């Protein structure tokens, strides 16, 4: 309807698609919502897995959002130094009821200057990059600070989105969506956190992430300097 | 020699049934993942999210894994002879024949659940038996080379299970960690066994029209298999 809650996700090359699509299917289940996928122009955008998503609007044509949500992914590094995207996020965040992100999307909120003195989380492997952007790093899966709501790494988007659903509507509605999603997880292993995975597996990861972390640190401190100026 | 993994991408798919498993499995080494429909191009999910089929049926390579997601669009597929025959074509030689949520109703309509243990989305579970399945009320159900997941978000649990079978436990564990899949749901309403009764009723109400329709479709699909 013309009165729908306006929810917008940033959609960019090399997005981690589940950061977007988990929350999208949660939130699109809610009463009278309209969900936008926003980029430089409408059209196909390739996620880091090769899954092709489709932006529905340019930045300029996106209507004022009630909720803005930034997903993460490899593509976050470029986005953190994209003035067009950061300006859009700042404009929308000035008036949005909720300003939100999943996984390394919070590094983009940070680059936009929106985390200074704010509690936030991100993907576990990149968590040390929050503080140089002014954030107070919090090791929880969903972190709230006023109208800021950030989720942890990738699949945390589902927990984040159900939390947001309860704020937008009510607990009854969020629970109904949870039940419709049959979201009673039973993971076949206990390796979803660096605090519980086998040590051998954890060591595989930090090593797999190490080059990216150095590059993302470089980018983070440049983004921070632009804020500092 | 890469593992060839194919998802059926159909109009009115429940996108998370596909995209959850896709991001799990595409994280694995030496895989190629396909999104299959009657032609390549845009396919719109039940939410209005637009996805893109990468291959027609014809151009799809022989699959190691076929995976059918669910969605509103399942009812049409259950009476689509092309889709069902394609699924049978791929299932004949696939190492793993799989589904998430109401995708198992499509496997059922195709004849591929006859005498097999299987699950589906809780709200439609009664439709498994008429399609010949032995219904099992578990989140991931294996019967030989058949693997079926429960409703929507069960796809993540299913895909990690499959990852360990295709590779090994350590590999599945690494993907789990990269996904940070340590869920912490904000409510306890993920199953009809734990959700408040009011919530279960609200969900059953919203399922009622499609369940009625799908009962009718199911009886027709079953009659075709019996004959």
CSV table of C-alpha atoms in Angstrom, one decimal:
chain,number,residue,atom,x,y,z
A,1,UNK,CA,0.0,0.0,0.0
A,2,UNK,CA,1.0,3.7,-0.3
A,3,UNK,CA,1.4,3.6,3.5
A,4,UNK,CA,3.9,0.7,3.6
A,5,UNK,CA,6.9,0.7,5.9
A,6,UNK,CA,9.9,1.6,3.6
A,7,UNK,CA,12.8,-0.8,4.0
A,8,UNK,CA,16.0,-0.4,2.0
A,9,UNK,CA,19.0,-2.6,1.6
A,10,UNK,CA,22.3,-1.5,0.0
A,11,UNK,CA,23.1,-3.9,-2.8
A,12,UNK,CA,26.7,-3.7,-4.2
A,13,UNK,CA,29.1,-5.9,-6.2
A,14,UNK,CA,30.6,-8.6,-4.1
A,15,UNK,CA,27.9,-8.4,-1.4
A,16,UNK,CA,27.6,-11.5,0.8
A,17,UNK,CA,24.2,-12.3,-0.4
A,18,UNK,CA,22.9,-14.1,2.8
A,19,UNK,CA,23.5,-10.9,4.8
A,20,UNK,CA,20.8,-9.3,2.6
A,21,UNK,CA,18.6,-12.3,1.6
A,22,UNK,CA,18.1,-13.7,5.2
A,23,UNK,CA,16.8,-10.3,6.5
A,24,UNK,CA,14.9,-9.7,3.2
A,25,UNK,CA,12.8,-12.9,3.6
A,26,UNK,CA,12.2,-12.1,7.3
A,27,UNK,CA,11.2,-8.5,6.8
A,28,UNK,CA,9.2,-9.1,3.5
A,29,UNK,CA,7.0,-11.4,5.6
A,30,UNK,CA,5.7,-8.5,7.7
A,31,UNK,CA,2.5,-6.6,7.2
A,32,UNK,CA,2.5,-3.8,4.6
A,33,UNK,CA,6.2,-3.3,3.9
A,34,UNK,CA,8.0,-2.3,0.7
A,35,UNK,CA,11.6,-3.5,0.3
A,36,UNK,CA,14.0,-1.6,-1.9
A,37,UNK,CA,17.4,-2.9,-3.1
A,38,UNK,CA,19.5,0.2,-3.8
A,39,UNK,CA,22.6,0.8,-5.9
A,40,UNK,CA,24.0,3.3,-8.4
A,41,UNK,CA,21.2,2.3,-10.9
A,42,UNK,CA,18.6,-0.5,-11.1
A,43,UNK,CA,19.8,-3.7,-12.6
A,44,UNK,CA,21.8,-6.8,-11.9
A,45,UNK,CA,24.5,-6.9,-9.2
A,46,UNK,CA,26.7,-10.0,-8.6
A,47,UNK,CA,27.2,-11.2,-5.1
A,48,UNK,CA,30.4,-12.8,-3.9
A,49,UNK,CA,29.2,-16.3,-4.6
A,50,UNK,CA,28.1,-15.4,-8.1
A,51,UNK,CA,24.4,-15.3,-7.3
A,52,UNK,CA,22.9,-12.4,-9.2
A,53,UNK,CA,20.6,-10.0,-7.4
A,54,UNK,CA,18.7,-7.0,-8.8
A,55,UNK,CA,18.8,-3.5,-7.6
A,56,UNK,CA,15.3,-1.9,-7.8
A,57,UNK,CA,16.3,1.8,-7.5
A,58,UNK,CA,19.2,4.2,-7.8
A,59,UNK,CA,20.3,6.2,-4.8
A,60,UNK,CA,18.7,9.3,-6.2
A,61,UNK,CA,15.3,7.7,-6.8
A,62,UNK,CA,15.0,5.8,-3.5
A,63,UNK,CA,12.2,7.1,-1.4
A,64,UNK,CA,12.8,8.2,2.2
A,65,UNK,CA,13.4,5.0,4.2
A,66,UNK,CA,12.0,3.9,7.6
A,67,UNK,CA,14.8,1.3,7.8
A,68,UNK,CA,18.1,1.3,6.1
A,69,UNK,CA,20.2,-1.9,6.2
A,70,UNK,CA,23.7,-2.4,5.0
A,71,UNK,CA,24.8,-6.0,4.3
A,72,UNK,CA,28.5,-7.0,4.3
A,73,UNK,CA,30.8,-9.0,2.1
A,74,UNK,CA,34.0,-8.7,0.2
A,75,UNK,CA,32.6,-5.7,-1.5
A,76,UNK,CA,32.6,-3.7,1.7
A,77,UNK,CA,36.2,-2.5,1.2
A,78,UNK,CA,35.2,-0.6,-2.0
A,79,UNK,CA,32.0,0.7,-0.4
A,80,UNK,CA,33.9,2.2,2.5
A,81,UNK,CA,35.6,4.6,0.1
A,82,UNK,CA,32.6,5.3,-2.2
A,83,UNK,CA,31.4,8.8,-1.4
A,84,UNK,CA,28.2,8.4,-3.4
A,85,UNK,CA,27.1,5.4,-1.3
A,86,UNK,CA,28.3,6.9,2.0
A,87,UNK,CA,26.4,10.1,1.3
A,88,UNK,CA,23.2,8.2,0.5
A,89,UNK,CA,23.6,6.3,3.8
A,90,UNK,CA,24.1,9.5,5.7
A,91,UNK,CA,21.1,11.2,4.1
A,92,UNK,CA,18.8,8.2,4.9
A,93,UNK,CA,20.2,7.7,8.4
A,94,UNK,CA,19.4,11.3,9.3
A,95,UNK,CA,15.6,10.5,9.1
A,96,UNK,CA,15.3,6.7,9.4
A,97,UNK,CA,13.5,5.1,12.3
A,98,UNK,CA,16.2,2.4,12.3
A,99,UNK,CA,19.7,2.4,11.0
A,100,UNK,CA,21.0,-1.1,10.6
A,101,UNK,CA,23.6,-3.5,9.2
A,102,UNK,CA,24.6,-7.1,9.1
A,103,UNK,CA,28.1,-8.5,9.4
A,104,UNK,CA,30.7,-6.3,7.8
A,105,UNK,CA,28.0,-3.8,6.8
A,106,UNK,CA,28.6,-2.1,10.1
A,107,UNK,CA,32.1,-1.2,8.8
A,108,UNK,CA,30.3,0.8,6.1
A,109,UNK,CA,28.1,2.5,8.7
A,110,UNK,CA,31.4,3.3,10.4
A,111,UNK,CA,33.0,4.7,7.3
A,112,UNK,CA,29.9,6.9,6.9
A,113,UNK,CA,30.5,8.4,10.3
A,114,UNK,CA,27.5,6.8,12.0
A,115,UNK,CA,29.2,4.7,14.7
A,116,UNK,CA,31.1,7.4,16.6
A,117,UNK,CA,30.6,6.6,20.3
A,118,UNK,CA,28.1,3.9,19.4
A,119,UNK,CA,27.9,0.2,20.5
A,120,UNK,CA,28.1,-2.1,17.5
A,121,UNK,CA,29.1,-5.6,16.3
A,122,UNK,CA,30.3,-7.1,13.0
A,123,UNK,CA,31.7,-10.3,11.6
A,124,UNK,CA,33.9,-12.0,14.2
A,125,UNK,CA,37.0,-12.0,11.9
A,126,UNK,CA,36.8,-8.2,11.4
A,127,UNK,CA,35.7,-7.1,14.8
A,128,UNK,CA,38.9,-5.2,15.6
A,129,UNK,CA,38.0,-2.7,12.8
A,130,UNK,CA,35.1,-1.2,14.7
A,131,UNK,CA,37.1,0.8,17.2
A,132,UNK,CA,39.1,2.9,14.7
A,133,UNK,CA,35.7,4.0,13.2
A,134,UNK,CA,34.7,5.3,16.6
A,135,UNK,CA,32.5,2.3,17.6
A,136,UNK,CA,32.4,0.6,21.0
A,137,UNK,CA,32.9,-3.0,20.0
A,138,UNK,CA,30.4,-5.4,21.5
A,139,UNK,CA,30.7,-9.2,21.2
A,140,UNK,CA,27.1,-10.0,20.9
A,141,UNK,CA,25.0,-11.3,18.0
A,142,UNK,CA,22.6,-8.4,17.8
A,143,UNK,CA,23.6,-5.0,19.3
A,144,UNK,CA,21.3,-2.0,19.9
A,145,UNK,CA,22.3,1.6,20.6
A,146,UNK,CA,19.3,3.9,20.3
A,147,UNK,CA,18.0,3.5,16.8
A,148,UNK,CA,21.1,1.7,15.7
A,149,UNK,CA,20.8,-2.1,15.4
A,150,UNK,CA,23.8,-4.2,14.1
A,151,UNK,CA,24.1,-7.9,13.5
A,152,UNK,CA,27.1,-10.1,13.8
A,153,UNK,CA,28.6,-12.2,11.0
A,154,UNK,CA,26.5,-13.4,8.0
A,155,UNK,CA,23.8,-15.7,9.4
A,156,UNK,CA,23.3,-13.3,12.4
A,157,UNK,CA,21.1,-11.4,9.9
A,158,UNK,CA,18.2,-13.7,10.7
A,159,UNK,CA,18.4,-13.1,14.4
A,160,UNK,CA,18.8,-9.4,13.7
A,161,UNK,CA,15.8,-9.2,11.4
A,162,UNK,CA,13.5,-11.0,13.8
A,163,UNK,CA,14.6,-8.6,16.6
A,164,UNK,CA,13.9,-5.7,14.2
A,165,UNK,CA,10.5,-7.2,13.3
A,166,UNK,CA,9.4,-7.1,16.9
A,167,UNK,CA,10.4,-3.4,17.2
A,168,UNK,CA,8.6,-2.5,13.9
A,169,UNK,CA,5.5,-4.4,14.8
A,170,UNK,CA,5.3,-6.5,18.0
A,171,UNK,CA,6.6,-9.8,19.5
A,172,UNK,CA,3.5,-11.7,18.3
A,173,UNK,CA,4.2,-10.7,14.7
A,174,UNK,CA,7.9,-11.5,15.0
A,175,UNK,CA,7.1,-14.9,16.5
A,176,UNK,CA,4.7,-15.7,13.7
A,177,UNK,CA,7.4,-14.9,11.2
A,178,UNK,CA,9.8,-17.1,13.1
A,179,UNK,CA,7.3,-20.0,13.0
A,180,UNK,CA,6.6,-19.5,9.3
A,181,UNK,CA,10.4,-19.6,8.7
A,182,UNK,CA,10.5,-22.7,10.9
A,183,UNK,CA,13.5,-21.0,12.6
A,184,UNK,CA,14.3,-23.6,15.2
A,185,UNK,CA,17.9,-24.2,14.3
A,186,UNK,CA,19.7,-27.5,14.9
A,187,UNK,CA,23.2,-26.9,13.5
A,188,UNK,CA,25.0,-30.2,12.7
A,189,UNK,CA,28.2,-29.0,14.2
A,190,UNK,CA,29.2,-26.5,17.0
A,191,UNK,CA,31.6,-24.4,14.9
A,192,UNK,CA,29.6,-21.2,14.5
A,193,UNK,CA,31.7,-19.1,16.9
A,194,UNK,CA,35.5,-18.9,17.2
A,195,UNK,CA,34.9,-19.7,20.9
A,196,UNK,CA,33.3,-23.1,20.1
A,197,UNK,CA,34.7,-24.4,16.8
A,198,UNK,CA,37.6,-26.9,16.8
A,199,UNK,CA,40.9,-25.1,17.3
A,200,UNK,CA,42.2,-26.5,14.0
A,201,UNK,CA,39.2,-25.0,12.1
A,202,UNK,CA,39.6,-21.7,13.8
A,203,UNK,CA,43.2,-21.6,12.7
A,204,UNK,CA,42.2,-22.3,9.1
A,205,UNK,CA,39.9,-19.2,9.2
A,206,UNK,CA,42.1,-16.4,10.7
A,207,UNK,CA,44.7,-17.5,8.1
A,208,UNK,CA,42.1,-17.5,5.4
A,209,UNK,CA,41.1,-14.0,6.5
A,210,UNK,CA,44.5,-12.5,7.2
A,211,UNK,CA,45.3,-10.8,3.9
A,212,UNK,CA,41.8,-9.3,3.7
A,213,UNK,CA,42.1,-8.1,7.3
A,214,UNK,CA,45.3,-6.2,6.4
A,215,UNK,CA,43.7,-4.7,3.4
A,216,UNK,CA,40.5,-3.8,5.2
A,217,UNK,CA,42.6,-2.2,8.0
A,218,UNK,CA,44.3,0.0,5.5
A,219,UNK,CA,40.9,1.1,4.1
A,220,UNK,CA,39.4,1.5,7.6
A,221,UNK,CA,42.1,3.9,8.7
A,222,UNK,CA,41.8,6.0,5.5
A,223,UNK,CA,38.0,6.1,6.0
A,224,UNK,CA,38.6,7.2,9.6
A,225,UNK,CA,40.9,9.9,8.6
A,226,UNK,CA,38.2,11.4,6.3
A,227,UNK,CA,36.0,11.6,9.3
A,228,UNK,CA,38.8,13.1,11.3
A,229,UNK,CA,38.9,15.8,8.6
B,1,UNK,CA,35.4,-32.7,-11.9
B,2,UNK,CA,34.2,-29.8,-9.7
B,3,UNK,CA,31.1,-30.8,-7.7
B,4,UNK,CA,28.1,-29.7,-9.9
B,5,UNK,CA,25.3,-28.4,-7.6
B,6,UNK,CA,22.0,-27.3,-9.1
B,7,UNK,CA,19.0,-25.6,-7.6
B,8,UNK,CA,15.7,-25.4,-9.3
B,9,UNK,CA,14.8,-21.7,-9.5
B,10,UNK,CA,11.1,-21.3,-10.2
B,11,UNK,CA,8.5,-18.5,-10.1
B,12,UNK,CA,7.2,-17.9,-6.6
B,13,UNK,CA,10.1,-19.7,-4.9
B,14,UNK,CA,10.6,-19.0,-1.2
B,15,UNK,CA,14.0,-17.4,-1.9
B,16,UNK,CA,15.7,-18.2,1.5
B,17,UNK,CA,15.1,-21.9,0.8
B,18,UNK,CA,17.6,-21.5,-2.1
B,19,UNK,CA,19.8,-18.6,-1.0
B,20,UNK,CA,20.7,-20.0,2.4
B,21,UNK,CA,21.9,-23.3,1.0
B,22,UNK,CA,23.5,-21.5,-1.9
B,23,UNK,CA,25.8,-19.3,0.2
B,24,UNK,CA,26.7,-22.4,2.3
B,25,UNK,CA,27.5,-24.6,-0.6
B,26,UNK,CA,29.1,-22.0,-2.8
B,27,UNK,CA,31.6,-21.5,0.1
B,28,UNK,CA,33.0,-25.0,-0.6
B,29,UNK,CA,36.2,-25.7,-2.6
B,30,UNK,CA,35.8,-27.1,-6.2
B,31,UNK,CA,32.1,-26.6,-6.7
B,32,UNK,CA,30.1,-25.0,-9.5
B,33,UNK,CA,26.5,-23.9,-8.5
B,34,UNK,CA,23.7,-23.6,-11.1
B,35,UNK,CA,20.3,-21.9,-10.8
B,36,UNK,CA,18.1,-23.8,-13.2
B,37,UNK,CA,14.8,-22.9,-14.9
B,38,UNK,CA,13.2,-23.5,-18.3
B,39,UNK,CA,15.4,-20.7,-19.7
B,40,UNK,CA,18.1,-18.5,-18.2
B,41,UNK,CA,16.9,-15.1,-17.0
B,42,UNK,CA,15.0,-13.4,-14.2
B,43,UNK,CA,12.8,-15.4,-11.9
B,44,UNK,CA,10.7,-13.6,-9.2
B,45,UNK,CA,10.5,-15.0,-5.7
B,46,UNK,CA,7.4,-15.0,-3.6
B,47,UNK,CA,8.6,-11.9,-1.8
B,48,UNK,CA,9.2,-10.0,-5.1
B,49,UNK,CA,13.0,-10.4,-4.8
B,50,UNK,CA,14.4,-11.1,-8.3
B,51,UNK,CA,16.8,-14.0,-8.9
B,52,UNK,CA,18.5,-15.1,-12.1
B,53,UNK,CA,18.5,-18.5,-13.6
B,54,UNK,CA,21.9,-19.3,-15.0
B,55,UNK,CA,20.9,-22.2,-17.2
B,56,UNK,CA,18.0,-23.8,-19.0
B,57,UNK,CA,17.2,-27.4,-18.3
B,58,UNK,CA,19.0,-28.4,-21.5
B,59,UNK,CA,22.3,-26.6,-20.8
B,60,UNK,CA,22.5,-27.8,-17.2
B,61,UNK,CA,25.4,-30.2,-16.8
B,62,UNK,CA,24.9,-33.6,-15.2
B,63,UNK,CA,24.5,-32.7,-11.5
B,64,UNK,CA,26.2,-34.2,-8.5
B,65,UNK,CA,23.5,-32.6,-6.4
B,66,UNK,CA,20.0,-31.5,-7.3
B,67,UNK,CA,18.2,-29.3,-4.8
B,68,UNK,CA,14.6,-28.3,-4.9
B,69,UNK,CA,13.6,-25.3,-2.8
B,70,UNK,CA,10.0,-24.6,-1.7
B,71,UNK,CA,7.6,-21.7,-1.9
B,72,UNK,CA,4.2,-20.7,-3.0
B,73,UNK,CA,5.3,-21.8,-6.5
B,74,UNK,CA,5.5,-25.5,-5.4
B,75,UNK,CA,1.8,-26.1,-6.2
B,76,UNK,CA,2.3,-25.3,-9.9
B,77,UNK,CA,5.4,-27.4,-10.1
B,78,UNK,CA,3.6,-30.4,-8.6
B,79,UNK,CA,1.6,-30.6,-11.9
B,80,UNK,CA,4.3,-29.4,-14.3
B,81,UNK,CA,5.3,-32.4,-16.3
B,82,UNK,CA,8.4,-30.7,-17.7
B,83,UNK,CA,9.7,-29.7,-14.3
B,84,UNK,CA,8.9,-33.1,-12.9
B,85,UNK,CA,10.5,-35.0,-15.8
B,86,UNK,CA,13.6,-32.8,-15.6
B,87,UNK,CA,13.9,-33.5,-11.9
B,88,UNK,CA,13.6,-37.3,-12.6
B,89,UNK,CA,16.2,-36.9,-15.4
B,90,UNK,CA,18.8,-35.4,-13.0
B,91,UNK,CA,17.9,-37.5,-10.0
B,92,UNK,CA,18.5,-40.7,-12.0
B,93,UNK,CA,22.3,-40.3,-11.7
B,94,UNK,CA,22.8,-37.6,-9.1
B,95,UNK,CA,24.9,-38.5,-6.1
B,96,UNK,CA,22.4,-36.6,-3.9
B,97,UNK,CA,18.8,-35.8,-4.5
B,98,UNK,CA,17.7,-33.1,-2.1
B,99,UNK,CA,15.1,-30.5,-1.1
B,100,UNK,CA,14.4,-27.7,1.4
B,101,UNK,CA,11.0,-27.0,2.9
B,102,UNK,CA,8.1,-27.6,0.5
B,103,UNK,CA,10.6,-28.6,-2.2
B,104,UNK,CA,10.1,-32.1,-1.0
B,105,UNK,CA,6.4,-31.9,-2.1
B,106,UNK,CA,7.9,-31.5,-5.7
B,107,UNK,CA,10.1,-34.5,-5.2
B,108,UNK,CA,7.0,-36.3,-4.0
B,109,UNK,CA,5.0,-35.3,-7.1
B,110,UNK,CA,7.9,-36.5,-9.2
B,111,UNK,CA,7.6,-40.0,-7.6
B,112,UNK,CA,11.0,-39.7,-5.9
B,113,UNK,CA,9.8,-40.1,-2.3
B,114,UNK,CA,7.9,-43.4,-2.7
B,115,UNK,CA,8.9,-45.5,0.4
B,116,UNK,CA,11.5,-43.0,1.5
B,117,UNK,CA,11.9,-41.2,4.8
B,118,UNK,CA,11.4,-37.4,4.3
B,119,UNK,CA,10.4,-34.1,5.9
B,120,UNK,CA,9.0,-30.8,4.8
B,121,UNK,CA,7.7,-27.5,6.2
B,122,UNK,CA,5.8,-28.2,9.3
B,123,UNK,CA,2.6,-26.6,8.1
B,124,UNK,CA,2.4,-29.0,5.1
B,125,UNK,CA,3.8,-32.1,6.6
B,126,UNK,CA,0.6,-34.0,6.2
B,127,UNK,CA,1.1,-34.0,2.4
B,128,UNK,CA,4.2,-36.3,2.5
B,129,UNK,CA,2.3,-39.5,3.2
B,130,UNK,CA,-0.1,-39.3,0.3
B,131,UNK,CA,2.9,-38.7,-2.0
B,132,UNK,CA,4.3,-42.0,-0.8
B,133,UNK,CA,6.9,-40.8,1.7
B,134,UNK,CA,7.4,-42.1,5.2
B,135,UNK,CA,7.0,-38.8,7.1
B,136,UNK,CA,9.7,-38.1,9.7
B,137,UNK,CA,9.5,-35.1,12.0
B,138,UNK,CA,13.1,-34.1,12.0
B,139,UNK,CA,14.8,-31.0,10.6
B,140,UNK,CA,17.2,-32.9,8.2
B,141,UNK,CA,16.2,-36.4,7.1
B,142,UNK,CA,18.5,-38.7,5.2
B,143,UNK,CA,17.4,-41.8,3.3
B,144,UNK,CA,20.3,-43.2,1.2
B,145,UNK,CA,21.2,-40.5,-1.2
B,146,UNK,CA,18.0,-38.5,-0.5
B,147,UNK,CA,18.4,-35.6,1.9
B,148,UNK,CA,15.4,-33.4,2.8
B,149,UNK,CA,15.2,-30.3,5.0
B,150,UNK,CA,12.4,-29.0,7.0
B,151,UNK,CA,10.8,-25.5,6.7
B,152,UNK,CA,12.7,-22.5,5.1
B,153,UNK,CA,15.6,-21.8,7.5
B,154,UNK,CA,16.3,-25.6,7.8
B,155,UNK,CA,18.1,-25.1,4.5
B,156,UNK,CA,21.1,-23.9,6.4
B,157,UNK,CA,21.3,-27.0,8.6
B,158,UNK,CA,20.7,-29.2,5.6
B,159,UNK,CA,23.4,-27.5,3.6
B,160,UNK,CA,26.0,-27.9,6.3
B,161,UNK,CA,25.0,-31.5,6.6
B,162,UNK,CA,25.4,-32.0,2.9
B,163,UNK,CA,28.7,-30.1,2.9
B,164,UNK,CA,30.2,-32.6,5.4
B,165,UNK,CA,29.0,-35.5,3.2
B,166,UNK,CA,30.5,-34.0,0.0
B,167,UNK,CA,33.7,-33.1,1.7
B,168,UNK,CA,34.3,-33.8,5.4
B,169,UNK,CA,33.4,-32.5,8.9
B,170,UNK,CA,36.3,-30.1,9.1
B,171,UNK,CA,35.3,-28.4,5.8
B,172,UNK,CA,31.7,-28.0,6.9
B,173,UNK,CA,32.9,-26.7,10.2
B,174,UNK,CA,35.0,-24.1,8.5
B,175,UNK,CA,32.0,-22.9,6.4
B,176,UNK,CA,29.9,-22.8,9.6
B,177,UNK,CA,32.5,-20.5,11.2
B,178,UNK,CA,32.8,-18.3,8.2
B,179,UNK,CA,29.0,-17.9,8.2
B,180,UNK,CA,29.2,-17.3,12.0
B,181,UNK,CA,26.3,-19.8,12.3
B,182,UNK,CA,25.9,-19.8,16.1
B,183,UNK,CA,22.2,-18.9,16.1
B,184,UNK,CA,20.6,-17.0,19.0
B,185,UNK,CA,17.0,-16.6,18.1
B,186,UNK,CA,15.2,-13.8,19.9
B,187,UNK,CA,12.1,-15.9,20.6
B,188,UNK,CA,11.3,-19.6,21.0
B,189,UNK,CA,8.6,-19.8,18.3
B,190,UNK,CA,10.5,-21.7,15.6
B,191,UNK,CA,8.5,-24.9,15.8
B,192,UNK,CA,4.8,-25.6,16.4
B,193,UNK,CA,6.0,-27.7,19.4
B,194,UNK,CA,7.4,-24.6,21.2
B,195,UNK,CA,5.6,-21.6,19.8
B,196,UNK,CA,2.7,-20.1,21.8
B,197,UNK,CA,-0.6,-21.5,20.8
B,198,UNK,CA,-1.8,-18.1,19.6
B,199,UNK,CA,1.2,-17.9,17.3
B,200,UNK,CA,0.6,-21.4,15.9
B,201,UNK,CA,-3.1,-20.5,15.2
B,202,UNK,CA,-2.1,-17.3,13.4
B,203,UNK,CA,0.4,-19.2,11.2
B,204,UNK,CA,-2.1,-22.0,10.5
B,205,UNK,CA,-4.6,-19.4,9.5
B,206,UNK,CA,-2.2,-17.9,7.0
B,207,UNK,CA,-1.4,-21.4,5.6
B,208,UNK,CA,-5.1,-22.5,5.4
B,209,UNK,CA,-5.9,-21.5,1.8
B,210,UNK,CA,-2.7,-22.9,0.3
B,211,UNK,CA,-3.0,-26.1,2.4
B,212,UNK,CA,-6.5,-26.6,1.1
B,213,UNK,CA,-5.3,-26.1,-2.5
B,214,UNK,CA,-2.2,-28.2,-2.0
B,215,UNK,CA,-4.3,-31.1,-0.6
B,216,UNK,CA,-6.2,-31.1,-3.9
B,217,UNK,CA,-3.0,-30.9,-6.0
B,218,UNK,CA,-1.5,-33.6,-3.9
B,219,UNK,CA,-4.3,-36.1,-4.5
B,220,UNK,CA,-4.1,-35.5,-8.3
B,221,UNK,CA,-0.3,-35.9,-8.2
B,222,UNK,CA,-0.6,-39.1,-6.2
B,223,UNK,CA,-3.2,-40.6,-8.5
B,224,UNK,CA,-0.8,-40.1,-11.4
B,225,UNK,CA,2.0,-42.0,-9.7
B,226,UNK,CA,-0.3,-44.8,-8.7
B,227,UNK,CA,-1.3,-45.2,-12.4
